[PDB]
Write a protein that binds this ligand. Sequence first.
Ligand SMILES: OC[C@H]1O[C@@H](O[C@H]2[C@H](O)[C@@H](O)[C@H](O)O[C@@H]2CO)[C@@H](O)[C@@H](O)[C@@H]1O
Ligand SMILES: OC[C@H]1O[C@@H](O[C@H]2[C@H](O)[C@@H](O)[C@H](O)O[C@@H]2CO)[C@@H](O)[C@@H](O)[C@@H]1O
Ligand SMILES: OC[C@H]1O[C@@H](O[C@H]2[C@H](O)[C@@H](O)[C@H](O)O[C@@H]2CO)[C@@H](O)[C@@H](O)[C@@H]1O
Lengths: 386, 386, 386
Amino acid sequence: MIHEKYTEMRNEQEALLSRKNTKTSFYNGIYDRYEHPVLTREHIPLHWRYDLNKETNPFFQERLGINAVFNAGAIKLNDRYCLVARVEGNDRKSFFAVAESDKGTEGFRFRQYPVCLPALTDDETNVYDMRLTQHEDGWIYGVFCVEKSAGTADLSEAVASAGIARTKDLTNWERLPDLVTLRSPQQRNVTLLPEFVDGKYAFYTRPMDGFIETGSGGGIGFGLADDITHAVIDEERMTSIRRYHTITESKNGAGATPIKTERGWLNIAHGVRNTAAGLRYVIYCFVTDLSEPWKVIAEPGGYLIAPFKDERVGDVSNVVFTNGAIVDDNGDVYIYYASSDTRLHVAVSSIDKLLDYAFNTPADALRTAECVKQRCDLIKRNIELL
Amino acid sequence: MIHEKYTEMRNEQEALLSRKNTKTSFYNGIYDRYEHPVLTREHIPLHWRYDLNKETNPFFQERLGINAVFNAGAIKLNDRYCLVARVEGNDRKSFFAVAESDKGTEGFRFRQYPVCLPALTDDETNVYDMRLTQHEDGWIYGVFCVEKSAGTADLSEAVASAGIARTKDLTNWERLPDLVTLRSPQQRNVTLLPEFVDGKYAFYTRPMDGFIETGSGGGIGFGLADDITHAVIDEERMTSIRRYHTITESKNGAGATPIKTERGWLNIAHGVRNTAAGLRYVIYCFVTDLSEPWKVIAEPGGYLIAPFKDERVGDVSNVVFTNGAIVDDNGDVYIYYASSDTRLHVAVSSIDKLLDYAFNTPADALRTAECVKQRCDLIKRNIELL
Amino acid sequence: MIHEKYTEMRNEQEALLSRKNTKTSFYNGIYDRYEHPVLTREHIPLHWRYDLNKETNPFFQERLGINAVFNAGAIKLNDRYCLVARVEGNDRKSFFAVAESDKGTEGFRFRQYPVCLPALTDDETNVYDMRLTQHEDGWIYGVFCVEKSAGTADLSEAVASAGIARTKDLTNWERLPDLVTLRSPQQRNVTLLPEFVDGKYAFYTRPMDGFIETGSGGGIGFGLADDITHAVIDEERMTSIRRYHTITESKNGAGATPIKTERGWLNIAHGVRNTAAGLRYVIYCFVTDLSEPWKVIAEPGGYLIAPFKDERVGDVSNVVFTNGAIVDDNGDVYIYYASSDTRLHVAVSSIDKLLDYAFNTPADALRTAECVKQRCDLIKRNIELL
Ligand SMILES: OC[C@H]1O[C@@H](O[C@H]2[C@H](O)[C@@H](O)[C@H](O)O[C@@H]2CO)[C@@H](O)[C@@H](O)[C@@H]1O
Ligand SMILES: OC[C@H]1O[C@@H](O[C@H]2[C@H](O)[C@@H](O)[C@H](O)O[C@@H]2CO)[C@@H](O)[C@@H](O)[C@@H]1O
Ligand SMILES: OC[C@H]1O[C@@H](O[C@H]2[C@H](O)[C@@H](O)[C@H](O)O[C@@H]2CO)[C@@H](O)[C@@H](O)[C@@H]1O
């Protein structure tokens, strides 16, 4: 009763799922790239997409296609690397699905079902880009974007807010009230710090006047909420901010969940600028202080990751983006970065390498002549050494 | 007197023109993709582009280059597959030219000359995207876009209308009056149904407030005109409409000429949405009722064709588009879809396959949590089967 | 003390620097393309980017990355082909650096240091796109864009002006006052003619109302300044202008420095139009009269160079751009054109070939039906010949 075409395609999918991944020749001394994505639309199990029944699907047509797999939350759970992937259906709605592997760079396979995330209202059209936090209160929190129609004459006009849900296993989710930020009508790129700050739940936020353009909103905010089960933030203290003629000029936002180090919170974030071709997204780092996490204590000039080779092209070209990283006990760091809103990659680094990058890459000299003086200082050091 | 360089380039062009095309490994159970485009700028005969005379063209320079070949009307005519291609010159003006083959997927060759299409006014700057209709009144009609300067201070401001011309052979064309739509100042993506409706000429239309943004214009309209030689439409009844967070959010429009089936009119159309990289065009289907062709009776969620691999990049990236299909008597369907406003491809399907897609692909569940429930229902069916 | 990783990477860089370049199969009878760029981010010497000291750079991390190398001025200097490249750092600021080769198409190597260009004010954030002029007054002039924050609430709002500097060697630069144009608040794509006109310094200019959109500004202007050391232009006489539905519709600007020929000034310039994917840049030619250099005496329809194959994609896709060419005494012409604001290419032609293109390529027929008549005339000539 299973269509004859299924077995051959299932065998091909199994081959893909198991395919080795290889470190490429890319080098910057900070992280490694890999030949293949860790997740693509073709990693979604065939029986999530095809009706296997030859009676009701005689031609074995794809009934529910997958358009893209990207922007994934990431966490280590019972010694497996777990990705809470943003999966965009053929119908253009995204949903979460979990893939796991015993390796950080290959072999990811989706669980039996996608994520059932309870809706709070009847007009939640999309949910996306979940950041996962292993919180000291004992829960795993997912903080994600919730998008609703604005209900105006402009059909494309939408409103973003931060959803909050918690879990022990990434299968069973308790949906808490959406975050309220008293000083901003919309939020995106919100993420929860793993530790209390002054006994409160602490977030990096991103206040926005609109759905695309931020305001008013000058950068990544830091905010405190008394109660995660009724989360309300008032003040949003600016941390890493938009700066003219830098990678963060148009807007910026937190990326991966804040990473705890002895030297501060390592924030792998994204910056946006406008070009003749549209918006360009890159990934950068900044470190915030442990006792004062609204205070930036390191921010290199420029980017850490930008679209490279085949990363440059996809549904939304000229974009790399991350909302997930995994840190192993030995200090290995797996940065899951998507490209062009289409596919998901991994970059492999370490805490020592990322901290050296963050603290020892020169700060942005901001103006061309000072940038040259800065680079000439380096050249002169090297020439002496030679 | 013919430049020595001509013979070698002519031999290379002949090799291209005759080159076999091969079905690729792409699979969705609905249509096949092919390795090569059916038409490109290099398919245009060398002697349409080069001055062959070595006296007046000593260096054998390309005098009238071709920039792109795309958005083609299509019709079967004396047992040949005929494409009325949109050919964009080096000078950025498009014109129509006919290519024919005895095969639907390869071997297309242009006729001796491009199309001489009489202008009605002295300010018709561009004509493009012709839909061909084999009408029951015995004529072949071409319905195309006519673009004129708006004549304002904004040099780029333009006005679109629907031109109508008829022919028996795609060489000799009678230019009729442009369509008038009393309730809309502009039109694009207009196409004529092959059959009368209540004794009148019937069109799918696309009312627009502006040259790029539609309004006001909520989707694809259905309209009736008493007289094709003085075509005037009043009411435009909405059919497939723009829907928030779907592939048709920003705008949509008819694509290929309506295809007659026993189950309704099969409309292979396009949907547009905005992204950080600009507008994204995909192709989708909807079926309208035979007795009430303003009434949509099937509309899958999502798209049928989206830019894939090398289709993604060109003059206008992230676009696929069709205004032509050919249906053989045995039910084979050839969908001619262009990518990125640069080149023309073919997708091969059948009426049975396209109808199964159209009626049996789940309708858009519109909101993420309902999309998941819908996909989980499919997964659960397949797991039981297993 | 030099990190062990340096030697292997230095050997790989040397291999790149020396790599042969090969003419491709591209043909239009006017210019040749080459397989490889003449300059990329990887051509920048490793010791401009890495700290070679293993004590201060234990992981051998890239401290000052290079994002792109493009839009280069070009001049022949002591029998070497010299490129004053726009080098964009990882931090998104550009600066000038000179590369030289004894061949026009390969083997380019950067000098010991980038260019130290004195700033006039403390708010010069970026400088870019220098056009080099070997002037009859005995100096080499560089005319470049100077960009400053507009200082408004809009962080991205910027102001462009034309900087002027002179040199004998491309190392030691005297920075003169920025050009003042009394009738336009901003300027970009300004270039100095190599000869006096009526005893004055003569420029092609590009008046602009804004930083991105021109106005008001209708095309490329011609202006005269009494004193290059206090350069002030009043009237800007229009030359090549924006034309609806041509490659120059949205805006245009001078490209490479005007090239002296017996038949007029050969201007290799750029044209811009808007598309669904963003702005598209192509390169075209026009010739101005020797005695009246505000007067256009040849302007082909269409473009000379457009993005081709891998040129199409980069930081700013769908762009080719030039602000540098080198003319050898034997008439060989090297056009240095960048693609997608990422990398720098060379196109090789000759004065005889470029003049034949400029004067004998049909003028734009402006409207589709007249474009067809024009092409049919050519076809008919060729068919007779056959
Ligand atoms: O698209 C690039 C990035 O934009 C953000 O999101 C999108 C979102 O993915 C779209 O579905 C929606 O239509 O509009 C948003 C535009 O901001 C960013 O946070 C990422 O989600 C995305 O990669
Ligand atoms: O460009 C994508 C699609 O846009 C529509 O047309 C263009 C037209 O091709 C351009 O020449 C003109 O400048 O503006 C229009 C923008 O809508 C669409 O119907 C297709 O023609 C085209 O593939
Ligand atoms: O980007 C395409 C072309 O735009 C012009 O310049 C840019 C400039 O390079 C950017 O750094 C700045 O942010 O905005 C300008 C937009 O016009 C053009 O003259 C070239 O510089 C560039 O290739």
